[PDB]
Design a protein around this ligand. Sequence first.
Ligand SMILES: O=c1ccn([C@@H]2O[C@H](COP(=O)(O)OP(=O)(O)O)[C@@H](O)[C@H]2O)c(=O)[nH]1
Ligand SMILES: OC[C@H]1O[C@@H](O)[C@H](O)[C@@H](O)[C@@H]1O
Ligand SMILES: OC[C@H]1O[C@@H](O)[C@H](O)[C@@H](O)[C@@H]1O
Length: 431
Amino acid sequence: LYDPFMKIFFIPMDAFGHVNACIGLARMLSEFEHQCIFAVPKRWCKPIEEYNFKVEIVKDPTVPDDQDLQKKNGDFVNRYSHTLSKTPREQFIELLIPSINRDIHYAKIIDGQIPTILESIDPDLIIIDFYVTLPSVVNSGKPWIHLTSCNPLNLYAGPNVPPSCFGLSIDTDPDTVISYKQFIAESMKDVKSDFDEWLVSKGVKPEPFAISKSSPYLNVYSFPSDLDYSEFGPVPDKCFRLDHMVRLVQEDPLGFDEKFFDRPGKKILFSLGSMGAADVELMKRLVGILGKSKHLFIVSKGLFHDKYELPENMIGAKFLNQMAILPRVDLVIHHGGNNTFVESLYFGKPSIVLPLFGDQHDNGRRAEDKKIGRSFRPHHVTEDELLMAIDELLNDKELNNRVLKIGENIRNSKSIDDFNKKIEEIIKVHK
Ligand SMILES: O=c1ccn([C@@H]2O[C@H](COP(=O)(O)OP(=O)(O)O)[C@@H](O)[C@H]2O)c(=O)[nH]1
Ligand SMILES: OC[C@H]1O[C@@H](O)[C@H](O)[C@@H](O)[C@@H]1O
Ligand SMILES: OC[C@H]1O[C@@H](O)[C@H](O)[C@@H](O)[C@@H]1O
């Protein structure tokens, strides 16, 4: 009252992989003194408030106000556990379509609430991390940025480029690319038809193939320069690469006594993400193999942690302080989740990738193609392949030096500075 900031409105899908990439970008933008506000359901309000971001609650009467954060996706993964071992084409129909039906339900539920919040907050910029189009954002008249927190293969979508979600070779011939595009379009025809009718009901022009509209302003993604798909040309039109969106801040308990770190031996973080460990039978299988390893494991045990025991070379908990753990381990065993994958590299750690579904398969392929890890299907991987791959990566000086240099390049990237200049040029013209 007696004395170039902006108000930034973040709309993430209600899951860790979207929320944690938005918190990571918000932390980076708050260093420039921007005010970041989050539109999230009630169960996510106090957890996001612990990072000193303002929260605008959106109603979702299909999920209780006080539900555990891991129950929604955990229950879903348990309900579809039989699909996790199937080929990527069986998964697309039996799992990814059921999964995107829940994204579409949530989009419809929140979309009608966003216009009132936009009128009240009057943000300068909207940032959305969603897998489907939001009409309230398209129609807001405000500049908006689409945030890609998953592997970025989908952004390269174009003639002769393999579609995402199948772990396809970057060498895939145009005949195979079309075969997969036709499989996707036939598989999605009913879901897309219903979703396009909803877009039309709100005055938005559907996409021919996609059900996620690109921002006409800017599209920001999280992927290391050293890993990016330069095989398919430069950074795509109206896209912007950040090497990472690692929050760094994590105010959650460690999950276990820190005295485990005093135990002598190589340390391995074994996390299948925020929902992968909900396949109890897979976790009991992988824990039985790793119990034969001479190394020490910290395990992200997930929603059903009370249904299974870890052997004595291991410690774990339902949910861990992964920001606290990563710098203190030697190797990560993960599912190829794009946050976990990039967090592992930020800290300069090699990885064993066990993809469950979707974009994980593309990070499985990428770990092998860029020689920064080893990839296997978790349900079929043999005892010998998994234990020998752990020793191989721990003792491979050339691959460890490779991932250390990638870690340094990620941590020392100044791309957020160029991002900040772009969003300022966009806000100046559009209000
Ligand atoms: O024990 C855990 C398990 C997960 N995470 C975080 O939850 C997010 C999971 O997202 P990701 O894309 O890695 O996998 P998803 O859970 O989305 O499949 C990541 O940011 C992890 O850092 C964590 O902090 N502690
Ligand atoms: O939850 C949405 C998605 O987040 C992404 O960052 C991960 O790659 C996927 O494992 C996950 O399905
Ligand atoms: O490729 C874009 C996204 O499509 C979704 O249907 C999948 O569940 C995600 O894993 C993927 O990242």
